[PDB]
């Protein structure tokens, strides 16, 4: 299926406590594979996935140099934004950036993007055409004009359609045993009493990969997507994912409700009952 290469960048100022915290985390699909965190005596770009051992020392030296360059530019950004928004030097602020590209199963580009947020709000984003930017407010309109005069979109587009796609393909090749695998979900249902003769049925889906999955509860062949409660799919600590979905049913009727699990590793979806 399709795959993605994404970099999540966060820079946070801490007045009175020194330089801003700077973190850049890279993901292929939903698996963390590289990271840089400024909060270390000797911050270095580090592998977070076993297959990244396949890159030579130059990869790490280059990515580390680039990261240190980012710490500096984001430190400047935090100051600039204080001016744009007329804010004081006493408070902590956050800049976030998500950059990435996605390819189809054939390795061809599907889409690319880069979006910024300041204090958790949209700031500026590259439009889908990868040619122009859209600004969320007047401060971002200043940035838009700077980047247009400097021709930043063309350079970013070159990275998204070129470099980003090429490296994603290489990561998928180098880490194929990990990235292109399919671990089927193993599911079970738990039962919990409630007041008012009602029971909570919780359908668990464990040990699966990739992360995409669908858990539904049915009654009389129909989905109860409405009254269901669920958690966002989440990492389980070893590179696999987990998820649960619950529904509150009448006591004594548990038998009529079925959990359905749909996943890439299930030619036929799983059907369970308490």
């Amino acid at each position: 299926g399709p795959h993605s290469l994404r970099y999540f960048v966060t820079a946070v100022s801490r007045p009175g406590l020194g330089e801003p915290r700077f973190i850049s985390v890279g993901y292929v699909d939903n698996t963390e594979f590289v990271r840089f965190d400024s909060d270390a005596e000797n911050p270095r770009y580090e592998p977070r996935a076993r297959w990244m051992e396949q890159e030579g020392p130059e990869y790490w030296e280059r990515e580390t140099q680039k990261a240190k360059g980012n710490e500096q530019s984001f430190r400047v950004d935090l100051r600039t934004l204080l001016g744009y928004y007329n804010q004081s030097k006493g408070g902590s602020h956050t800049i976030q950036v998500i950059s990435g590209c996605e390819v189809g199963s054939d390795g061809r580009l599907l889409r690319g993007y880069q979006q910024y947020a300041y204090d958790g709000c949209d700031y500026i984003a590259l439009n889908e055409d990868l040619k122009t930017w859209t600004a969320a407010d007047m401060a971002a309109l200043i940035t838009k004009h700077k980047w247009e005069q400097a021709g930043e979109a063309e350079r970013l587009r070159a990275y998204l359609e070129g470099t980003c796609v090429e490296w994603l393909r290489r990561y998928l090749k180098n880490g194929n045993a990990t990235l292109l695998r399919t671990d089927s979900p193993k599911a079970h249902v738990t039962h919990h009493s409630r007041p008012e003769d009602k029971v909570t049925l919780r359908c668990w889906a464990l040990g699966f990969y990739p992360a995409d999955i669908t858990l539904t509860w049915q009654l009389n062949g129909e989905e109860l997507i409405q009254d269901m409660e669920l958690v966002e799919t989440r990492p389980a600590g070893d590179g696999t994912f987990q998820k649960w979905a619950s529904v509150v049913v009448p006591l004594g009727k548990e038998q009529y409700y079925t959990c359905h699990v749909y996943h890439q590793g299930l030619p036929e979806p799983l059907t369970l009952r308490w």
Partner: peptide
């Protein structure tokens, strides 16, 4: 949550996923 349903005496992994928060600190 744990990676595997818990079984006393059997190795496992314990997770604490903290989400949907802002600011990052």
């Amino acid at each position: 949550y744990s990676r595997h349903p818990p079984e006393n005496g059997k190795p496992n992994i314990l997770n604490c996923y903290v989400t949907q928060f802002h600011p990052p600190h």
